[PDB]
Amino acid sequence: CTSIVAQDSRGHVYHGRNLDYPYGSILRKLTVDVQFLKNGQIAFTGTTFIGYVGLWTGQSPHKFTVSGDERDRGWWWENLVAALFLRHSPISWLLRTTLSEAESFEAAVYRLAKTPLIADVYYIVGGTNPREGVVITRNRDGPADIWPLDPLKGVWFLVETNYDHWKPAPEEDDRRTPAIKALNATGQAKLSLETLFQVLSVVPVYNNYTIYTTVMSAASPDKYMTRIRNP
Amino acid sequence: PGPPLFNVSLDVAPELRWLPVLRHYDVELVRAAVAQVIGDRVPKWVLALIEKGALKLERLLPPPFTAEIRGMCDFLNLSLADGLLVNLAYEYSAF
Ligand SMILES: CC(C)(C)CC(C)(C)c1ccc(OCCOCCO)cc1
Ligand SMILES: CC(C)(C)CC(C)(C)c1ccc(OCCOCCO)cc1
Ligand SMILES: *[C@@H]1O[C@H](CO)[C@@H](O)[C@H](O)[C@H]1NC(C)=O
Ligand SMILES: *[C@@H]1O[C@H](CO)[C@@H](O)[C@H](O)[C@H]1NC(C)=O
Ligand SMILES: [Cl-]
Ligand SMILES: [Cl-]
Ligand SMILES: [Cl-]
Ligand SMILES: [Cl-]
Ligand SMILES: [Cl-]
Ligand SMILES: [Cl-]
Ligand SMILES: [Cl-]
Ligand SMILES: [Cl-]
Ligand SMILES: [Cl-]
Ligand SMILES: [Cl-]
Ligand SMILES: [Cl-]
Ligand SMILES: [Cl-]
């Protein structure tokens, strides 16, 4: 999977993501966008598969946008002890709980970072104001690292696949470089939802296992766009 | 166009809120689909261990997490163990 939060020259923040997973021929037919209503009014939007109640891609309108990528660390028995004996939270559920109860980008980044989990994950959050963008590397008991946007220092985009950003992506699976490569060339002046979609449409960022691509901006909720990918 | 768009009112009890969506889906496609994600990656005794202890396991998970799954599995006629196995699929193999 590949999550990208980036800022453009005019101060806007965009969030896009890819979701790769086997059994694609099935999940593509079951993929749906869902609008969760409170009192008849939309409270947040998400992309999920029929039968899955958690969210791996969501948007709280005019507050923030969050997505999740897999982080495989620890031992198999950690997830067991954490889930049953310690009663930690599932990843996809916390992501959904936050989209519904967090009152601000700051509040969401707090919940997604400090709430205990059953297993590790990468949480990517975007905001409605400039420089609001982070990549929360999660340990089970807390945050292992927070990676903030810094446009004035030249970092106007964060690219997260499934590996810690302070280390190089493995040779076997290095979808970070072609994603950075396409962003380095797109330019902070040309960045938009249309362009950010074409970034994620690059190979091998867009590979055989990609199921859907979502591009979203918390301050432009009506532009929430998901597209099923048939490679 | 993109994928279908549905509404899920959180003002409806957890077990009922997902059901208006399932009307649009073949109860067989969903159920048969699960067996392919399940049968090929988990032995039965695990599934039996879960099934036997599934009703005590769901006591631990968040109430609204399981309640929504329970309602879908009754409507679709799925085993609750199969339900909890796909929703905790990430947590089952992420280490
Ligand atoms: C009809 C089913 C089989 C689909 C679902 C089941 C039995 C689990 C069900 C059936 C009814 C039910 O009541 C919810 C209404 O409560 C409003 C305030 O609490 C909750 C669950
Ligand atoms: C009950 C589950 C499996 C649905 C979820 C939890 C999180 C508790 C879980 C998740 C993972 C898990 O790992 C067991 C691997 O077995 C290897 C055998 O040598 C054990 C339990
Ligand atoms: C979801 O709810 C809104 C609330 O006004 C409604 O307008 C819309 O039609 C609903 N979505 C669908 C697909 O019916
Ligand atoms: C529904 O589930 C019950 C209990 O497992 C079973 O006896 C029945 O044949 C099932 N019906 C369908 C249509 O799946
Ligand atoms: Cl909720
Ligand atoms: Cl809050
Ligand atoms: Cl700025
Ligand atoms: Cl830990
Ligand atoms: Cl731990
Ligand atoms: Cl990475
Ligand atoms: Cl398009
Ligand atoms: Cl395509
Ligand atoms: Cl309807
Ligand atoms: Cl459909
Ligand atoms: Cl209809
Ligand atoms: Cl047994």
For residues B45 and B52, what is the distance between their CA atoms, to the nearest angstrom? Answer: 10
CB contact under 8 Å between B37 and A92, yes or no, is no
Query: What is A125-182 written as a DSSP string?
Result: EE-SSTT-EEEEEE-SSSEEEEEE-BGGGTB-EEEESSS-TTSPPPSSS--HHHHHHH
Query: How many residues are listed for chain B in this entry?
Result: 95
Sort out which chain B residues have CB atoms less than 8 A from A73's CB and list them: 95
CB B75 less than 6 A from any atom of ligand 2: no
Residues less than 5 Å from ion ligand 8, measured at CB: A 139-141
Residue of A89, A95, A123 lying closest to A1 (CA atoms): A123
Q: Whose CA is nearest to atom 3 of ligand 2?
A: B92
Note if A2 is an active site residue: no
Closest of B41, B42, B54, B53 to residue B80, by C-alpha: B54
From ligand 10's centre to the CA of A158, what distance in Å? 9
- Chain B environment of A94 (Cβ under 8 Å): none
- List phi, psi (to 5°) of B93: -135, 20
Cα–Cα distance measured from residue A97 to residue A99, given in angstroms and rounded to the nearest whole number: 6
Q: Quick one: CA dihedral B91, B93, B94, B95, positive or negative? A: positive
Please tell me the distance from the alpha carbon of residue A73 to that of residue B5, in angstroms, as a whole number: 35
Distance B21 CA to ligand 15 centre (A): 11
A160 touches chain B (CB under 8 A): no
Please state, in angstroms and as integers, the Cα–Cα distance from residue A111 to each residue in A55, A82, A92, A119, following that order. Answer: 15, 18, 13, 16
- How many residues belong to chain A? 231
Tokens of B38: 């399940």
Using omega within 30 degrees of 0 as the cis cutoff, is the peptide bond preceding A204 cis?
yes
Resolution as reported, in Å: 3.0
Q: Which residue of B has its CA nearest to A37?
A: B9
Strands A31-38 and A41-49: antiparallel
- A159 contacts A176 by C-beta, under 8 angstroms: yes
Instruction: For helices B63-76 and B27-39, give the axis angle rounded to 10 degrees.
Output: 120
Structural element, H or E, at residue A37? strand A31-38
